[PDB]
Amino acid sequence: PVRLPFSGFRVQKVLRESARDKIIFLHGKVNEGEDAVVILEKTPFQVEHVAQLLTGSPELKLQFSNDIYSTYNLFPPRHLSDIKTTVVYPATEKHLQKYMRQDLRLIRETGDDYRTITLPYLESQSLSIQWVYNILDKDRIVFENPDPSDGFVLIPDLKWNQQQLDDLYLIAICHRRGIRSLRDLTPEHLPLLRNILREGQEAILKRYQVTGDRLRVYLHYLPSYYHLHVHFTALGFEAPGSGVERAHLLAQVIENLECDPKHYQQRTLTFALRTDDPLLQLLQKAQQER
Amino acid sequence: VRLPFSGFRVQKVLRESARDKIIFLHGKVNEEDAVVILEKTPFQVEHVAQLLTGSPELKLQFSNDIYSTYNLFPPRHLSDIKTTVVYPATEKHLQKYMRQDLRLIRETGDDYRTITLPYLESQSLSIQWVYNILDKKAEADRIVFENPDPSDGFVLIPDLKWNQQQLDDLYLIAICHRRGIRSLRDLTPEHLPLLRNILREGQEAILKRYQVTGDRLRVYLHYLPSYYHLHVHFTALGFEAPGSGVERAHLLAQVIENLECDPKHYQQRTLTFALRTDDPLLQLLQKAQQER
Numbered sequence: 001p002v003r004l005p006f007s008g009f010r011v012q013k014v015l016r017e018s019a020r021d022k023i024i025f026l027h028g029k030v031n032e033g034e035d036a037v038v039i040l041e042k043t044p045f046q047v048e049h050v051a052q053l054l055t056g057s058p059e060l061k062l063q064f065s066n067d068i069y070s071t072y073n074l075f076p077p078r079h080l081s082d083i084k085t086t087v088v089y090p091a092t093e094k095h096l097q098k099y100m101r102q103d104l105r106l107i108r109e110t111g112d113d114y115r116t117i118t119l120p121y122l123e124s125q126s127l128s129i130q131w132v133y134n135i136l137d138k139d140r141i142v143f144e145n146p147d148p149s150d151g152f153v154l155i156p157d158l159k160w161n162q163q164q165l166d167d168l169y170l171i172a173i174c175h176r177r178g179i180r181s182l183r184d185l186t187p188e189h190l191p192l193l194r195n196i197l198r199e200g201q202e203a204i205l206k207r208y209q210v211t212g213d214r215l216r217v218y219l220h221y222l223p224s225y226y227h228l229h230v231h232f233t234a235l236g237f238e239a240p241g242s243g244v245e246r247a248h249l250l251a252q253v254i255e256n257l258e259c260d261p262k263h264y265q266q267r268t269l270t271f272a273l274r275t276d277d278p279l280l281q282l283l284q285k286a287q288q289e290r
Numbered sequence: 291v292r293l294p295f296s297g298f299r300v301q302k303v304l305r306e307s308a309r310d311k312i313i314f315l316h317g318k319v320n321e322e323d324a325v326v327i328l329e330k331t332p333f334q335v336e337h338v339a340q341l342l343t344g345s346p347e348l349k350l351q352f353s354n355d356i357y358s359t360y361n362l363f364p365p366r367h368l369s370d371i372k373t374t375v376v377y378p379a380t381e382k383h384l385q386k387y388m389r390q391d392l393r394l395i396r397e398t399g400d401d402y403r404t405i406t407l408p409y410l411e412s413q414s415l416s417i418q419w420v421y422n423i424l425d426k427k428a429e430a431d432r433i434v435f436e437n438p439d440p441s442d443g444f445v446l447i448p449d450l451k452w453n454q455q456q457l458d459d460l461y462l463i464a465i466c467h468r469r470g471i472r473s474l475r476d477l478t479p480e481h482l483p484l485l486r487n488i489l490r491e492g493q494e495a496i497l498k499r500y501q502v503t504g505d506r507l508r509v510y511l512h513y514l515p516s517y518y519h520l521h522v523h524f525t526a527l528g529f530e531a532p533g534s535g536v537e538r539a540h541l542l543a544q545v546i547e548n549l550e551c552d553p554k555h556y557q558q559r560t561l562t563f564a565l566r567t568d569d570p571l572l573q574l575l576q577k578a579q580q581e582r
Contacts, residue, residue: 002347002348002349002350002360003346003348004342004346004348004360005358008343009339009342009343010339011335011338011339014335017333017335018332018532019332020309020310021309021310021311022310022311022330022331022332023333024333024335024338026338028339028342038342040333040338040341040362042311042330042331042333043311043330044306044307044308044311045306045311045313045328045330046313047303047306047313049302050313050315050326051298051300051315054293054298054315054317054326055296055297057292058293058294059291060291060293060373061446062291067412068376068377068378068379069375069376070294070374070375070376070377071372071373071374071375071376072291072373072374072375073370073371073372073373074328074370074371074372074373075366075368075369075370075371075487076370076371078363078369080371081363081364081369081370081371082362082363082364083341083361083362083363083364084349084359084360084361084362085359085360085361085362086357086358086359087359087360088356088357088362089358090356091356091543101458101528102528104336104505104506104527105505105506105525105527106504106505106506106508106544107505128487166432168475184433212394213393213394213395214392214393214394215394216394216535216536216537218536235392235393235394235537235564236390236392238530238535242535242536242537242541243508243530243534243535243536244508244510244534244535244536244539244540244541245508245527245534245541247535247536248536249536249537249562251396251560251562252560252562255559255560257395259552259559260551260552263562267547267551268543268544268547268556270541270543270544272527280514
């Protein structure tokens with residue numbers, strides 16, 4: 001008899017849940033007592049399973065019908081209704097904070113906020129980007145413009161298995177050092193930016209036969225690391241951070257610089273931060289003061 | 291209780307989503323077309339303890355020191371799948387459920403004035419339902435806030451599908467009183483007062499009603515919009531709301547600042563959006579852009 005590594009399960013808290021994604025993250029009390037996190041996720045369908053079920057006399061309860069539309073509760077065989085079950089036991093506070101639904105706040109960072117508050121904060125963290133430099137200094141590179149000022153490398157995202165094009169995701173990392181984000185972009189960077197957009201699209205076209213009009217090509221602000229990089233995703237893939245509150249289309253960044261050379265130093269950029277992110281309180285305090 | 295046909299043969303997967311755990315199938319039957327849609331149900335908080343207690347049927351898949359993963363095999367009454375059948379299905383149904391095939395368009399200001407706008411001028415906007423809300427002929431009791439100013443005012447109404455028990459999914463729409471403002475393309479500094487009122491008073495109204503502060507809201511316009519009378523979407527920052535992607539959503543605060551910085555921004559700049567391959571506008575734009 002296969003068992004969970006504890007006795008009983010009482011829900012203390014729903015940490016996170018998504019009706020959309022058919023997933024729930026539970027903080028349970030067990031062995032009453034101890035903390036455990038249990039994540040339950042309904043499984044995706046396998047078309048062969050479904051095809052075979054629909055010719056095998058499925059157990060159906062009719063809920064509603066009109067002349068052509070009918071809805072049922074289907075009570076499937078067990079290979080369609082298994083639930084992916086992830087267990088963290090015992091769960092620490094770190095685990096509980098990890099799985100807790102994010103609590104985000106928007107901040108509208110002015111040019112002066114960035115200069116006076118954000119930049120100092122980032123410099124105080126000065127997190128390593130040595131992994132970036134390791135890639136640039138050199139097997140996964142799909143395309144490279146080796147120009148040390150206007151060049152870049154293009155690499156598949158680690159999570160893209162390349163088993164399909166639906167979730168195509170590549171990243172361009174510039175060779176040039178010290179361009180921390182959008183905030184550092186000036187017309188000096190236009191050749192670089194244009195190179196990434198043009199040559200990155202050319203590369204993807206030649207390698208995967210995906211045209212540029214099927215790609216969403218963007219930067220994040222705030223970026224996950226502070227060395228300029230560009231996301232190239234399938235337009236049909238609702239990729240990470242492709243929301244308006246984080247993503248900035250490269251073509252539009254370029255045109256923004258063309259139209260206003262000082263755009264990225266002067267304009268207000270809007271982004272989200274977790275409520276426990278120290279930068280959020282620094283920015284909020286600064287904004288309250290003026 | 292049987293399906294309303296037999297001999298289902300999959301012709302095509304019209305759409306499937308591993309993220310959303312749904313599959314839409316086009317089958318041939320009675321050798322007619324049918325569509326069958328299966329959807330895994332969301333978890334209900336009140337049943338999860340019973341899923342996990344007692345002696346649930348499990349198969350261990352992986353375990354390291356603290357993390358393990360199983361397949362859990364729910365009992366029958368906790369196993370059901372939502373199943374929808376359209377039979378006989380028509381071409382219309384098949385097109386309805388087919389996955390969207392989109393292309394990005396970068397519409398220059400000249401593309402807009404030469405191609406897009408003449409197309410739009412040829413179409414009735416079919417917005418009497420909008421007018422009915424503005425005029426209190428429909429949905430009046432659903433209005434959460436109104437600034438009744440006919441130039442710079444608006445009404446704020448919740449999305450009909452929103453279950454307001456769940457602030458996570460917060461979604462309201464501001465519709466302006468002023469008529470004739472099709473989209474972002476029509477926006478000039480004339481509209482700044484309206485835009486500013488929407489942002490300010492819409493946030494205020496949502497703080498008052500829901501005790502949700504403005505910094506928890508994504509407030510944006512779509513381009514292209516779903517209908518051609520200016521409206522603004524107010525959504526929970528945690529809700530991946532309809533069209534909040536960068537290729538359709540424009541934050542209201544940024545729209546305002548854009549206009550403050552360059553009065554002709556929305557007539558001059560290239561706007562980037564996605565269209566279905568069968569959209570008549572994509573046909574027009576693509577052919578025209580290629581000629582140019």
